[PDB]
Amino acid sequence: ALSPKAATLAERSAGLAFSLYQAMAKDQAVENILLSPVVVASSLGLVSLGGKATTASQAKAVLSAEQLRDEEVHAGLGELLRSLSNSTARNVTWKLGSRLYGPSSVSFAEDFVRSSKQHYNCEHSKINFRDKRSALQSINEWAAQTTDGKLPEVTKDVERTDGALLVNAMFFKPHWDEKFHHKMVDNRGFMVTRSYTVGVTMMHRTGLYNYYDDEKEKLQIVEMPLAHKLSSLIILMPHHVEPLERLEKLLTKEQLKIWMGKMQKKAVAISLPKGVVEVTHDLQKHLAGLGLTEAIDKNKADLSRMSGKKDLYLASVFHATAFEWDTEGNPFDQDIYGREELRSPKLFYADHPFIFLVRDTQSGSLLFIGRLVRPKGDKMRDE
Structure with missing residues (x-):
């Protein structure tokens, strides 16, 4: 402490x-x-x-x-x-x-x-x-x-x-508390804007995560615990492919506390761009x-x-x-969550700009704050 x-x-x-x-x-x-x-x-x-x-x-x-x-x-x-x-x-x-x-x-x-x-x-x-x-x-x-x-x-x-x-x-x-499978990766498009898409590798997994879908402010929030639940990575992504300016006006210490108080542990299928x-x-x-x-x-x-x-x-x-952003993390017992608990998950598909935070679990202090607008990748254009 x-x-x-x-x-x-x-x-x-x-x-x-x-x-x-x-x-x-x-x-x-x-x-x-x-x-x-x-x-x-x-x-x-x-x-x-x-x-x-x-x-x-x-x-x-x-x-x-x-x-x-x-x-x-x-x-x-x-x-x-x-x-x-x-x-x-x-x-x-x-x-x-x-x-x-x-x-x-x-x-x-x-x-x-x-x-x-x-x-x-x-x-x-x-x-x-x-x-x-x-x-x-x-x-x-x-x-x-x-x-x-x-x-x-x-x-x-x-x-x-x-x-x-x-x-x-x-x-x-x-390092995720529950790892992504190293083969659960593929090529997908990431929409930097509504008219510009870059080719990225995306990593995918389904698990139980703290989640909230804000219907009023039009965004999803998911919390991904890191190794031994000592910290967690929170992602805030708007419903639409849009500039982050609108959601950044809502990004205050008070609104983040309201949003985090509304998160419930649900089955979520998370897809994230993989890379440095x-x-x-x-x-x-x-x-x-x-x-x-x-x-x-x-x-x-x-x-x-x-x-x-x-x-x-x-x-x-x-x-x-x-x-x-990589797949590696701690292993987990697959038999514990199993069937029924994960059959119809919420879909958190990070294919467009999002805001993220890394927060210490014990103290609640921020380790990192940032946003992913342009991943490291190839600009898609017709040949």
């Missing part, structure tokens, strides 16, 4: 992940979204640790932790990061690395290196943004080794080359929108506890994830 300081921080991390998700969903250029609330919260904790004056105090205000001591924030977020390598198969289904890249003309303070490694497992590296090809190669190779090739590239270009670059590289593969979804977000521009305004500006940032370099600021916060 988590301490009361970790529990209060976990609650704010979820509210923070909803705000970032909403801010990113408004951006027309954004297709898939993958955010890990606790990794986002740890990025703010690193700004608090390396900052001073309103630069550090704004980071604590975004985490609603102004009434907590600095040591309570760093130990509380550190506890939540280590509790993630416990609910999942640590270093098999969940890999995380955090690295701060400063220019070659910058030396990180020993005190900051010590404490950022202690609380956030943060790594530090000097980078030369002059040779742009070798700077991108260093970031990408570090992310590729962190995820063992699952995320081979974080970014193709670094826009702001005069500040600190925080990079978070992740690989997450939900690779998403990179530069969160720097959306962090200013939430209250972290000083850290992200060259002429306002005070990251002097991080380094004494003139005008050092947070240039980028890369949040890069390889999320793998």
Whole structure:
């Protein structure tokens, strides 16, 4: 179990992940979204640790932790990061690395290196943004080794080359509490829009799942428990093939609690696209929108506890994830559910954009929030 300081921080991390998700969903250029609330919260904790004056105090205000001591924030977020390598198969289904890249003309303070490694497992590296090809190669190779090739590239270009670059590289593969059969896969079309379909591999299974069909708001919700029921993946998909904007307006902490209170364990035939979804977000521009305004500006940032370099600021916060949808999970007794209990199931066919969350069962805290709009696959056109 988590301490009361970790529990209060976990609650704010979820509210923070909803705000970032909403801010990113408004951006027309954004297709898939993958955010890990606790990794986002740890990025703010690193700004608090390396900052001073309103630069550090704004980071604590975004985490609603102004009434907590600095040591309570760093130990509380550190506890939540280590509790993630416990609910999942640590270093098999969940890999995380955090690295701060400063220019070659910058030396990180020993005190900051010590404490950022202690609380956030943060790594530090000097980078030369002059040779742009070798700077991108260093970031990408570090992310590729962190995820063992699952995320081979974080970014193709670094826009702001005069500040600190925080990079978070992740690989997450939900391990189902009841596995899909490895041969229960086939080729299907996924409708990105009503006029654009891509070819995907879909995986299929029937089982007893918590489910709700909202006839008023026109969507289905299903809860898929992960290994040992320590967490679960919730999918919210509209009835029609449509942009997720309408359903994203309903996506609040209050409405999610109402929807989850209406879910009943029913027989459901679930079909999901199978594959790795690779998403990179530069969160720097959306962090200013939430209250972290000083850290992200060259002429306002005070990251002097991080380094004494003139005008050092947070240039980028890369949040890069390889999320793998696969059949693997725990085995189960087929004789227990058997016949009658599964003959006429509800059909949850994820062939069009949907929103998803990974929620800790014991604490109710969010591990992940995102949406699948464009799977990795072939655009269908007449030959």
